[PDB]
Amino acid sequence: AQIGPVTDLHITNANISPDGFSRPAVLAGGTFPGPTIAGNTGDNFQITVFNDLTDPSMLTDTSIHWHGLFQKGTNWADGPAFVTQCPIITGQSFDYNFNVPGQAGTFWYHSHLSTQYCDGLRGPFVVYDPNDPNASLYDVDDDTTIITLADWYHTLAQQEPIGAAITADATLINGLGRSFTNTTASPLSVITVQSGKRYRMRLVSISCDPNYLFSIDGHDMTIIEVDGVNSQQLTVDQIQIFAAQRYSFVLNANQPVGNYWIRAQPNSGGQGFDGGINSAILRYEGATVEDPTTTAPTTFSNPLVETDLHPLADLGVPGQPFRGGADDPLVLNLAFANGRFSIDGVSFVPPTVPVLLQILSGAQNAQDLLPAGSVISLPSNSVIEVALPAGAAGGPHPFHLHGHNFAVVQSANNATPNYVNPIWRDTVSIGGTGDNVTIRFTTNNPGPWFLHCHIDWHLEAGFAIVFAEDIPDTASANPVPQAWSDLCPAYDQAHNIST
Ligand SMILES: *[C@@H]1O[C@H](CO)[C@@H](O[C@@H]2O[C@H](CO)[C@@H](O[C@@H]3O[C@H](CO)[C@@H](O)[C@H](O)[C@@H]3O)[C@H](O)[C@H]2NC(C)=O)[C@H](O)[C@H]1NC(C)=O
Ligand SMILES: *[C@@H]1O[C@H](CO)[C@@H](O[C@@H]2O[C@H](CO)[C@@H](O[C@@H]3O[C@H](CO)[C@@H](O)[C@H](O)[C@@H]3O)[C@H](O)[C@H]2NC(C)=O)[C@H](O)[C@H]1NC(C)=O
Ligand SMILES: [Cu+2]
Ligand SMILES: [Cu+2]
Ligand SMILES: [Cu+2]
Ligand SMILES: [Cu+2]
Ligand code: NA
């Protein structure tokens, strides 16, 4: 069952064995992935998060981010630790009370403390649209049509060396999959369809690192949504999905009744499908209960290419049709050396006082804010352009901006910008050496918004900056509840920190 929009959510430690290997984890709602949180567009969500964690090896504090939800007027509820709040301590709870005006689509929630979401705190978050303009393109859209893709590690996250190339031990599809080494024939996930029906499959990357080549043998996929943004219909036979991205696609159950492999090949870790790694099963009602016998093609003839995507609505592009054609045109210098990432010469290390609390306490320019050199102010009601030229080790890096979606003016592997009709999204691969992936948005949401690579090991190694958007209006725009004001005193008392 789905939960929400008003619900409790308990965060616990438990043993799980999603690939046959038992390890302890950090779980929401007692499962991996966590339960789907759902509501309708414009609803009030009140997710009262109970921190019941006791195992220090995965951290007993927590904080949860609602990925892709704009949090306009509720920056305090966004979740990134030491940007918008201090962590919730064990034995305490916190009501994330916010609204989702003007958004409808496929989202997710995850821990936003250290690398804790890798240890299991990740689940789907769906905002349905009762008047969806795509409603007539499918018959079925429910909890059974959500497909999560996850990396899973046998080593606990707090034992992963900072700045290292860290590699997973299994791909999990809907929480199940097989280990790349010491492979055992543990259970695979089954997605069941009825011959002749059309399904809105909501594909969610809950990855901490790898991108996946996703396909379904015998079937093609008609994309209708990208990171919450409705798209024109685009039919593909493979989707390369980067960490934290989402797609909705129409699956037409138009092939003979039978069993078909669902494939998710990561860019690192186990390659291929031996022993049923990187796999799940599409089963038609009436098919025999047995593994598929289907083959992938040697090459995919209609893969997703990001420049093929276009919004369903006439979203356009803000600013002027050339590089630098914005009120505030930025170019970030994105680098890696010696185990640490940097942005504009500064490696991100979380501050003691959350950025939002520094601003509410009166610090009002970005050079007054900590960490020094890690906060860039943005002017209000302005067109912002951010060029993100690739080349830093560990690519391709999927960059994500909190508080906003953005026009993808230039995509990976293509030097031509699009100032007319590019897709809008919230997480974008910056590509490879010599690329110049560039995003645009307008500043209509006061508050500090994190910008970072969504490979969680890279964020931990410093690949982040904070956009302090409209500092002067942050306090008036974002009134804070007493329970939020109580978080830093409680956290600092529990941890013997002076501030
Ligand atoms: C990605 O696109 C951005 C624009 O969106 C390019 O930025 C441009 O970068 C050049 C230098 O590479 C800038 O010109 C330089 O400016 C300094 C003065 O600030 C000057 O001292 C240098 O001699 C040179 O003129 C330019 O300001 C900047 N913005 C523009 C043109 O709008 C960036 O180079 C592109 N990166 C890649 C890898 O393609
Ligand atoms: C590399 O990225 C560029 C920019 O996104 C892509 O260029 C765009 O290509 C599309 C598809 O061909 C062009 O749209 C077409 O326009 C013609 C003429 O109006 C129209 O008859 C078709 O209905 C379609 O809309 C679009 O103009 C063009 N944009 C620009 C700025 O060049 C390009 O396709 C990408 N390269 C690859 C290999 O995918
Ligand atoms: Cu996220
Ligand atoms: Cu986010
Ligand atoms: Cu990265
Ligand atoms: Cu984030
Ligand atoms: Na425009």
Automatic annotation (TrEMBL):
Pfam family membership, one: Cu-oxidase_2
Primary location class: secreted
Taxonomic superkingdom: Eukaryota
GO molecular function, one term: hydroquinone:oxygen oxidoreductase activity
SUPFAM superfamilies in UniProt: Cupredoxins
Binding site for Cu(2+) 2: 67, 110, 454
Subcellular location: Secreted
Domain (Plastocyanin-like): residue spans on this chain: 11-131, 144-287, 349-470
Stated family: Belongs to the multicopper oxidase family.
Protein name: laccase
